[PDB]
């Protein structure tokens, strides 16, 4: 398994699975249709229409009428100086016309011993009454053995101080204090009829990418078939086996003031394999001979005939020179050589490939001339030429 089809497999299951991973969050936060209302998936629902029979819309107002019929946990902490402490709600009201000083009311909750060098609970005891009378509600912390306040309630019923631990200074008549405010299935993928990957479902029926907890296999199969339509699923009991395949016939289009022509669509009222051809002949290629006899290799005869007739067309060239020229052309075309050092072997192939031809034509002198010619270009050494001609003349004798 080379990485080519592996990578294409990975991409072809990345893009639809990426689209479905997007659609997962999309239909979670913005569902398209309620899954409870499906006929093949109704176990998710956990109620019936019994209450609709005994319901009465006119009698609903009494229920909300009888419905109309924070948990401040102030925790103290050890002080930072060099005793007991008590919390109090200081309600400062609006100024009435008869009074010149503002109304002030100090409701102490209770005392508690705290170290130096408990808690108090308040279950919605603001007592503002929503009558436009509570201008501010501060939290005073009395101590002995340093007293100070802090604006808790804002003007617009906003909270000033944050939750969690905190600390605040004080002044009798550095030294401070601390407190804490608080308000088994098995997928088998198949692409070009190749078992590219084989896995096993971790969960029993939790979908792999949609992640819905369906307690039935038929509902899971119908969900995988209808939804997530880029794939095609097949099922046979053989531990469960699922056979996945890519659907290469999707309906990808737009599917949608401005004019258009009218239509009336109604759907429900009461429910490698392609042939090939040769290159030069263009005849039909049988499937039996595809890898064997690979065309476009073993370079054609018209190039050889062109190399023949081109150098034969040359005027001021002799007969044996043209003969050894076409022999060298056929040799280098039969075995391509681009490396310079490999040419030292190439001549040693020539006597081993056409030596008997040149003895039958007496072309050894022009062959040595061609050898010296290529030697002039500094392609080969001269002792290699000596070895080659000695090896040729040994077998020639």
């Amino acid at each position: 398994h080379v990485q080519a089809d592996h990578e294409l497999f990975l991409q072809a299951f990345e893009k639809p699975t990426q689209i479905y991973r997007f659609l997962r969050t999309r239909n979670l936060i913005a569902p398209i249709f309620l899954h409870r209302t499906l006929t093949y998936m109704s176990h998710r629902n956990s109620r019936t229409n019994i209450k609709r029979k005994t319901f009465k819309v006119d009698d609903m107002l009494s229920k909300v009428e009888k419905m109309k019929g924070a948990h401040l946990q102030l925790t103290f902490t050890g002080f930072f100086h060099k005793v007991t402490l008590e919390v109090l709600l200081v309600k400062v009201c609006h100024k009435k016309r008869k009074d010149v000083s503002c109304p002030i009311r100090q409701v102490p909750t209770g005392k508690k011993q705290v170290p130096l060098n408990s808690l108090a609970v308040s279950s919605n005891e603001f007592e503002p009454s929503n009558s436009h009378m509570v201008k501010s509600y501060s939290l005073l912390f009395r101590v002995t053995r340093f007293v100070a306040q802090m604006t808790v309630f804002d003007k617009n019923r906003r909270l000033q101080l944050l939750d969690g631990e905190y600390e605040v200074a004080m002044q009798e008549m550095g030294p401070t204090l601390q407190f804490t405010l608080r308000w088994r299935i098995f997928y088998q993928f198949l692409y070009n009829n190749n078992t590219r990957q084989q896995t096993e479902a971790r969960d029993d029926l939790h979908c792999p990418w949609c992640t819905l907890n369906c307690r039935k296999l038929y509902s899971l199969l119908k969900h995988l078939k209808l939804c997530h339509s880029r794939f095609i699923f097949n099922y046979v009991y053989h531990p469960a086996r699922i056979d996945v395949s890519i659907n290469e016939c999707y309906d990808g289009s737009y599917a949608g003031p401005v004019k258009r022509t009218p239509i009336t669509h109604i759907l429900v009222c009461r429910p490698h394999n392609r042939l090939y051809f040769h290159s030069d002949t263009c005849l039909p290629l049988r499937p039996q001979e595809m890898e064997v006899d690979s065309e476009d290799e073993k370079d054609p005869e018209w190039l050889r005939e062109k190399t023949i007739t081109q150098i034969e067309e040359f005027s001021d060239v002799n007969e044996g020179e043209k003969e050894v020229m076409k022999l060298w052309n056929l040799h280098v075309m039969k075995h391509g050589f681009i490396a310079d050092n490999q040419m030292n072997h190439a001549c040693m192939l020539f006597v081993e490939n056409y030596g008997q031809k040149i003895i039958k034509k007496n072309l050894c002198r022009n062959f040595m001339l061609h050898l010296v010619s290529m030697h002039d270009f500094n392609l080969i050494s001269i002792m290699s030429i000596d070895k080659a001609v000695t090896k040729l003349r040994e077998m020639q004798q």
């Binding site: 569902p31 398209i32 019936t48 909300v64 209808l226 949608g256 009218p262 009336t264 669509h265 009222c269």
Partner: protein, 387 residues
Amino acid sequence: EAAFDDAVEERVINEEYKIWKKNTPFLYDLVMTHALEWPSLTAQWLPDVTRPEGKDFSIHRLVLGTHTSDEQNHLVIASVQLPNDDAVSGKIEIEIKINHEGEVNRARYMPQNPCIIATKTPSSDVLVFDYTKHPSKPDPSGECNPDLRLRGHQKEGYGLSWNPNLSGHLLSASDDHTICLWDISAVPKEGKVVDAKTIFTGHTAVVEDVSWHLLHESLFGSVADDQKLMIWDTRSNNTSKPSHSVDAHTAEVNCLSFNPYSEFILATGSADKTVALWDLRNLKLKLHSFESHKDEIFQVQWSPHNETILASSGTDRRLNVWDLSKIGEEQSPEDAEDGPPELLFIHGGHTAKISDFSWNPNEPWVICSVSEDNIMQVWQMAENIYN
């Protein structure tokens, strides 16, 4: 930046529409996806019906508006073939097409005389047609023949409502801070134009829906874009102060509807992504706020065949329908993951702004819907859902 986002959103909407087209044969008893030549900002079933005893399918009728551009507007009276209890057969047929003055924003048939149909315009002059007098085809010249014109506003709007008890009493709204009320029964037949019988002006914003109370003809209700609902008594001789006025929503209110069975209870749909339930005995307390829609709601209609059912739709491209009897009920966690318990169905078969929808007064749990992208759907949910 925005164009590519709209493009990929349209691709996702196409994928969701294909998924809906694949999944629809397990949810509905009837489906009929029809596209019109022009869009429709209004759709309403009529009470007439024909039942050939030899054939299995019944015939129903629809009133539909148009919203055109550089073309004559045709108010459509169409027909539809609904299988009753048996049987792939049934098509849409356009019966009558009447030339209309400009586009259409709202259209309502008289419950007393179904032949009389009031319609709005993009100008002040709304009008009223009677198709029995008109011919069965349109005029190619384009000069419309209005049967009963009506004036009194200074701008366009969306609100329109007939009085079910009193004949001729017709309310209409407009965004010029006025609510017109006409009574066409008093004018003779020769008089084709009628002045405003009365105009009410108490709001301080764009009024966007009005409706007569059903079992009490002496008052009506309205909601406006001042975050305000106002119940107006007709007996009072003061056209400024209403009988009740409530800040019933956090944003601009868009639609209202009264119950056919009950008389005091009503529902509203607003632009703060909510439907709300109110009562005509103590309008101070908000009874309940249904929050599943995620955009501006534009229409809500109580069901005629059921009392504890509500509907809503807007530019979210998903028509919601709710059951009031299932309110505040405990359910499974996976059942709650999809949505609240009261939410009965989410018909997300559209691909654009759901412009209008309506119920049929003589068939169970069936509705029609019209969008701006030249789509007109009709469907009835399965029996297994509601039982």
